[PDB]
Amino acid sequence: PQEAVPSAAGKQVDESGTKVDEYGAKDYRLQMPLKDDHTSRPLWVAPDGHIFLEAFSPVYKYAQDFLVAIAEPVCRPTHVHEYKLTAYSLYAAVSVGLQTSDITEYLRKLSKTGVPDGIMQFIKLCTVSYGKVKLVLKHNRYFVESCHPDVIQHLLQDPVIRECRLRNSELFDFYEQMDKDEEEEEETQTVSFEVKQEMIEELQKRCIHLEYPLLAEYDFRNDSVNPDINIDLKPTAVLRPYQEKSLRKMFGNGRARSGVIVLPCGAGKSLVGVTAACTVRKRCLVLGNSAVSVEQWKAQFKMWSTIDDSQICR
Amino acid sequence: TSGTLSPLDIYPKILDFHPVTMATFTMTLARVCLCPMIIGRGNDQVAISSKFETREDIAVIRNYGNLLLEMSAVVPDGIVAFFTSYQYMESTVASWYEQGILENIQRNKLLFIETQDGAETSVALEKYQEACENGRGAILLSVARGKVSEGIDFVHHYGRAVIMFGVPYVYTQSRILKARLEYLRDQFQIRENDFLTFDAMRHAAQCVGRAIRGKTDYGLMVFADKRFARGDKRGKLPRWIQEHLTDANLNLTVDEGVQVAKYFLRQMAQPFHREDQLGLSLLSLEQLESEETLKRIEQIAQQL
Amino acid sequence: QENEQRRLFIQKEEQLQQILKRKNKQAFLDELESSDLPVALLLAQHKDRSTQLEM
């Protein structure tokens, strides 16, 4: 159990026996209670997860960013936009640090209709447990961390999880480089412990089963044990703003935030990947469906990175 | 009397001195003249810094070259670049020249590199100052410790932007420094890491302090080192400068600094004449005869 | 002799106080793992114990 199956595959909130009218439209006038400020509230929150936005609304700028950060885009014509809520779209919002209350409050504030309880339930189901805890990997130490001790305290009550924790501490630094000693700054909002090297594989199932998926982050920079290959980007590599933000989203905290990146065909997708590899400066495994991608990557690495034919291998 | 030292709490300890007053004064302006920011984060998300004991790390040098190149196109008139050490400066320039970055910088502004030769210093400053006034534009680069940060004031068009590459730590001559540091631990109980921070911060404050000398003067200032983001280091900068060093501009990306600079330049390149200065930041005899001047200025003073 | 004593005295304090705090932190983590203490306050209690030692 690692795919967080329930909200993804079970989709508890998908309607059945929908009150489809004679015209064939879903009659949600009754399901979506009428609410005031039809001119100031730019959203419609359909109970099936679809959301509609007005590109001409005065708050469209914020509402667009709001929907872009919370829902998957469907269509963006000149005057109206369509978005669809999904567990993965919601989990992406949670991992950014957005709270269920804030999401519900701003939705209720921007929605022309009251938010349907089924969508509010889907919001809860996809925000309460979906990403409140992080699995740091620094110095080869698997540290489990959460912004709130409340989340880990509940998690730590699990006897199987308790068997995973390791009693270790970790040091500071010397005057040669006492920033690692000054890394004791901001231990507020920070609580973590090490987990035994081999328990992770089983603990992951247990935490996801326990409804607390771990946000794994690899601290490639301070990991001393995995040797660096001095990988670096060629001056030919210039990051486009979307690429820069995509990497910012990934490396924003400083560690490689594991996850999925979506880049439409034609983007400098390879430049983003090569930059990520050049940023990690650790040995990288790359997977494709054909030897063509393998040599296509190799050629793109040659043009944007220092990595040699003694170092890139098919 | 000048505004360059901070924190004031360390000088009575260091100088084994006890002043009657330990005050500071807030820069009072109707239109700010200064936008201190810490661009500690590269576009490639590399933590731009010199934390690595000044070790050869091309990734930060590369990022330093990218920042300077784009900033050379953004800042008008002259730029003044301060390195943490002369060695690192020379090492850095050689890399940027080898990587060709330096040629793109020349296209943007005339580079003038400092050297211990008074002939170089005098000629560089001669050509730089007038290059900043002729049709072209120039970009002075020097070391945060050298006399250039001491004898030259970057007034008005000269050095409209000051860039501090890395925290100015002198880890060379550590033995003599250790001895003085140790003696400070002994008779003054001053922590070495605390003193080191202060000592570098005061040098950064020197470059910044010489970047402005009037109200019809302004200076962009980039602190290209993650270190500066620590509350301790930021907290030890001059309080009147910290006022403009808003958290929102901490660990900015290169692009953010470029955009903020374009914005900051746009916001202050606009006409603002002597008559416009009489609204706030300038008090005439009429305002002096008005007791308001007596009560309003009270809050300008600061203490530490 | 004082130079030797100064170094050792300083180093012993640093090592002890640093690790002892993380020893309390380990206990604090043991409490979060198995105690029923108020999780919102348990952090403040840990900060109390450590600050009382640091001060």
Question: What's the distance, Cα to Cα, between the start and end of chain C in Å?
Answer: 28
The three state secondary structure string of A11-40 is CCCCCCCCCECCCCCECCCCCCCECCCCCC
A271 inside 8 A of chain C by CB: no
Tell me if A205 is assigned to a ligand binding site.
Answer: no
Contact of B42 with B254, CB cutoff 8 Å: yes
Q: Using the beta-carbon criterion (under 8 Å), do A232 and B59 form an inter-chain contact? A: yes
CA triplet B81, B85, B87: central angle to 5 degrees?
A: 110
Alpha-carbon distance A171 to A291, whole Å? 45
* A24 phi, psi to nearest 5 deg: 90, -5
A179 inside 8 A of chain B by CB: yes
Tell me if A263 is assigned to a ligand binding site.
Answer: yes
CB-based burial, B260-299: b 16+ in 10 Å, e otherwise: bbeebbeeeeeeeeeeeeeeeeeeeeeeeeeeeeeeeeee
A193 inside 8 A of chain C by CB: yes
Which residue from B200, B196, B111 is spatially nearest to B149, judged by alpha carbons?
Answer: B200
Which resolution in angstroms does this entry have?
4.1
Which of A174, A181, A217, A244 to probe by mutation at the B interface, max B CB count within 10 Å?
Answer: A244
> Which tokens hold the place of B296?
């309003």
* A209 phi, psi to nearest 5 deg: -60, -45
Tell me if A246 is assigned to a ligand binding site.
Answer: no
Contact of A42 with A59, CB cutoff 8 Å: yes
Q: Using the beta-carbon criterion (under 8 Å), do C43 and A171 form an inter-chain contact? A: no
Contact of B238 with B4, CB cutoff 8 Å: yes
B46 inside 8 A of chain A by CB: yes
How far lies A151's CA from each of A76, A155, A207, C40, in Å?
A: 38, 6, 12, 11
How far lies B102's CA from each of A258, A285, B68, B114, B163, in Å?
A: 36, 35, 9, 15, 16
HSE-up of residue B269 (Cα within 13 Å, Cβ side) = 13
Q: Using the beta-carbon criterion (under 8 Å), do B51 and A251 form an inter-chain contact? A: no
> Which tokens hold the place of A250?
């990934």
A contacts of B231 (beta carbons < 8 Å): 185
CA triplet A268, A270, A275: central angle to 5 degrees?
A: 100
Helix (H, G, I), strand (E, B) or coil at B302: strand
> Which tokens hold the place of B264?
């900051």
Tell me if A265 is assigned to a ligand binding site.
Answer: yes
CA triplet A279, A273, A313: central angle to 5 degrees?
A: 90
What are the DSSP E strand ranges found in chain B? 23-25, 34-37, 79-83, 110-113, 138-143, 161-165, 219-224, 301-303
Backbone breaks in chain C after residues (C–N over 2.5 Å): none
Contact of B59 with B143, CB cutoff 8 Å: no
Contact of B97 with B104, CB cutoff 8 Å: no
C contacts of A150 (beta carbons < 8 Å): 39-40
A228 inside 8 A of chain B by CB: no
Helix (H, G, I), strand (E, B) or coil at B33: coil
Residues of B (88-107) whose Cβ lies below 8 Å from A: 99-101
Contact of A32 with A113, CB cutoff 8 Å: yes
Q: Using the beta-carbon criterion (under 8 Å), do B253 and A182 form an inter-chain contact? A: no
Q: Using the beta-carbon criterion (under 8 Å), do A247 and B232 form an inter-chain contact? A: no
Handedness of CA B281, B285, B286, B291 (dihedral sign): positive
User: Chain-centre distance of CA B36, in angstroms?
Assistant: 8
B contacts of A252 (beta carbons < 8 Å): 45
Contact of A151 with A189, CB cutoff 8 Å: no
Q: Give A111's contacts (C-beta < 8 A, 6+ positions apart).
A: A35, A41, A43, A44, A45
Q: What are the structural domains, with CATH classification, of chain B?
A: 34-269 (3.40.50.300)
> Which tokens hold the place of A104?
């519900």
* B110 phi, psi to nearest 5 deg: -65, 120
Tell me if A101 is assigned to a ligand binding site.
Answer: no
Closest-CA residue in chain B for A273?
B44
Tell me if A8 is assigned to a ligand binding site.
Answer: no
DSSP for residue A6: I
Which residue from B230, B238, B263 is spatially nearest to B38, judged by alpha carbons?
Answer: B230
Q: Using the beta-carbon criterion (under 8 Å), do A250 and B227 form an inter-chain contact? A: no
